Amino acid sequence: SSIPGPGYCMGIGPLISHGRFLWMGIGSACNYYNRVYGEFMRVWISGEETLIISKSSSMFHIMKHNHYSSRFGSKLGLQCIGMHEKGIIFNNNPELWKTTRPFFMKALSGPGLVRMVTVCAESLKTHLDRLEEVTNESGYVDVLTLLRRVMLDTSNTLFLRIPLDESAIVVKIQGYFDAWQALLIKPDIFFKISWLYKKYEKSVKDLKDAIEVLIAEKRRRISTEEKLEECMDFATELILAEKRGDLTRENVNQCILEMLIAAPDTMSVSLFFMLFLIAKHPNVEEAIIKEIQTVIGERDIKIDDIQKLKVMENFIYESMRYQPVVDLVMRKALEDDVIDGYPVKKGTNIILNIGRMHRLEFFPKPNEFTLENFAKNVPYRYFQPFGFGPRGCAGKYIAMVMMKAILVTLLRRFHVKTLQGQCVESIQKIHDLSLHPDETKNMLEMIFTPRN
Numbered sequence: 001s002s003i004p005g006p007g008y009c010m011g012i013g014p015l016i017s018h019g020r021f022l023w024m025g026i027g028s029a030c031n032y033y034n035r036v037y038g039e040f041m042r043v044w045i046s047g048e049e050t051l052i053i054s055k056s057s058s059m060f061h062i063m064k065h066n067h068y069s070s071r072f073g074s075k076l077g078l079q080c081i082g083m084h085e086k087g088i089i090f091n092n093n094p095e096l097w098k099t100t101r102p103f104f105m106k107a108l109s110g111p112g113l114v115r116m117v118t119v120c121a122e123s124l125k126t127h128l129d130r131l132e133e134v135t136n137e138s139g140y141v142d143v144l145t146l147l148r149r150v151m152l153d154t155s156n157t158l159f160l161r162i163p164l165d166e167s168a169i170v171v172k173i174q175g176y177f178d179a180w181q182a183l184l185i186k187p188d189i190f191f192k193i194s195w196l197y198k199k200y201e202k203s204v205k206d207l208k209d210a211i212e213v214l215i216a217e218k219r220r221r222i223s224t225e226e227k228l229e230e231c232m233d234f235a236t237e238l239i240l241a242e243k244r245g246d247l248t249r250e251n252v253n254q255c256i257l258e259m260l261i262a263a264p265d266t267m268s269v270s271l272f273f274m275l276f277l278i279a280k281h282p283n284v285e286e287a288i289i290k291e292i293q294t295v296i297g298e299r300d301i302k303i304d305d306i307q308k309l310k311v312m313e314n315f316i317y318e319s320m321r322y323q324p325v326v327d328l329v330m331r332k333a334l335e336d337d338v339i340d341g342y343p344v345k346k347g348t349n350i351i352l353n354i355g356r357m358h359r360l361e362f363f364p365k366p367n368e369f370t371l372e373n374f375a376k377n378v379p380y381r382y383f384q385p386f387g388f389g390p391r392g393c394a395g396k397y398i399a400m401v402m403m404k405a406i407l408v409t410l411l412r413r414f415h416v417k418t419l420q421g422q423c424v425e426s427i428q429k430i431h432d433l434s435l436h437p438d439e440t441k442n443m444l445e446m447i448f449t450p451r452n
């Protein structure tokens with residue numbers, strides 16, 4: 001089979017599609033092209049031919065095989081944000097990625113995943129006792145900020161544990177994300193005219209500098225620690241690997257940064273959507289509350305509780321399926337292969353449109369929010385909210401633990417109301433690198449009214 005997609009108009013084809021991506025945003029442009037042309041089609045970002053695919057079969061092939069364990073993006077953009085061959089998220093050097101990923105995998109499972117359930121609860125409790133920090137005169141709670149702050153506090157106390165300015169770092173993380181999202185697929189031309197990006201450059205330096213202060217302190221405490229065996233964590237593991245000859249300092253620093261931003265970026269927006277859904281689906285909210293009473297009562301949340309929270313689990317899955325944040329995955333072909341019917345040359349970029357996939361393929365009622373979509377065991381080859389395989393989400397398991405933990409301890413204590421008519425469907429959204437609320441609009445607040 002040949003490859004569907006717009007015509008290469010002697011070098012105008014590329015310029016339209018790239019422009020379309022820049023104007024529309026990666027996400028929406030992906031949905032546009034899959035709607036016009038097939039569920040498997042071809043576009044250009046910069047020079048490179050880039051496939052946009054929503055086919056579950058293609059999805060599965062790509063995530064399963066080692067020769068797609070790469071992403072893509074502007075080299076200049078990635079260098080600017082410090083992710084060019086440095087972190088893991090957008091580290092596209094196969095060997096450097098291969099040797100960095102293990103550090104993330106260790107910290108995000110085993111004992112750390114067990115600690116996380118209780119660390120999460122405490123962090124949320126502490127902030128729910130400080131609602132004055134985030135609540136309006138008319139009782140409007142800034143949930144986005146609240147969530148980001150606990151997500152950061154959580155990540156810090158688990159992976160780095162150095163005291164920090166919660167509120168400041170949160171704003172800086174938001175700054176970093178904009179830069180990341182802004183520069184990821186800008187053409188090289190863009191980077192020539194400098195009063196066009198120095199904006200983003202300063203956001204990166206803001207966060208990076210702020211984190212250096214923290215890593216610097218972490219280095220001191222380690223160099224004077226008596227029971228070094230007793231108190232291992234993610235940052236320490238990296239620093240020791242660096243003091244063998246295994247890692248670069250630049251690399252260590254980017255890793256710590258990537259580990260700190262991950263949950264604030266994705267978990268908080270995810271939980272936010274989840275909370276709005278709860279507010280608009282009383283039936284579902286009752287099921288959850290009943291399950292909590294049955295399983296937990298008023299005991300503190302514990303690791304052994306999490307498997308038992310079946311209703312919630314399905315709620316989280318359905319929320320993610322219906323209202324994704326991470327609706328698209330960027331990959332690159334490292335070897336030549338034939339995928340379904342189509343030839344895929346090495347160096348070909350790939351965007352997997354998992355959000356659209358979850359609305360076309362397996363589910364009984366794709367275009368409406370129901371736990372019915374999860375009434376029967378769903379094969380992981382038709383539902384990929386995290387990705388799987390050698391480069392699937394590093395936090396895929398701990399994420400489920402965290403989301404359960406915070407959903408439990410929040411709803412346990414508060415009923416959540418939405419302002420006016422507002423629901424996830426009516427929220428104005430940016431659909432670019434991820435799918436999130438446009439925060440230049442308003443009516444994004446909620447009302448937290450007590451229980452009992």
Ligand code: HEM
Nearest residue numbers: 088089262263266267270326386387391392393394395399
């Ligand atoms: C609901 C929250 C989350 C969602 C929806 C999500 C989803 C995803 C997806 C779809 C990917 C791409 C995987 C692939 O290419 O197949 C990814 C990558 C990644 N995620 Fe998450 N994730 C979440 C939470 C987290 C958390 C809490 C962490 C750690 C604190 C994390 C760390 C990472 C890292 C480091 C990568 C890059 C992996 C690599 O390229 O090797 N994620 N995530």
Ligand SMILES: C[C@]12CCC(=O)C=C1CC[C@@H]1[C@@H]2CC[C@]2(C)C(=O)CC[C@@H]12
Nearest residue numbers: 089261262265266326328329330433434
């Ligand atoms: C999950 C994630 C990493 C942690 C973080 O801090 C924020 C995000 C959101 C964007 C994700 C990214 C991982 C790589 C993803 C899946 C892509 O290939 C395109 C969108 C992008």
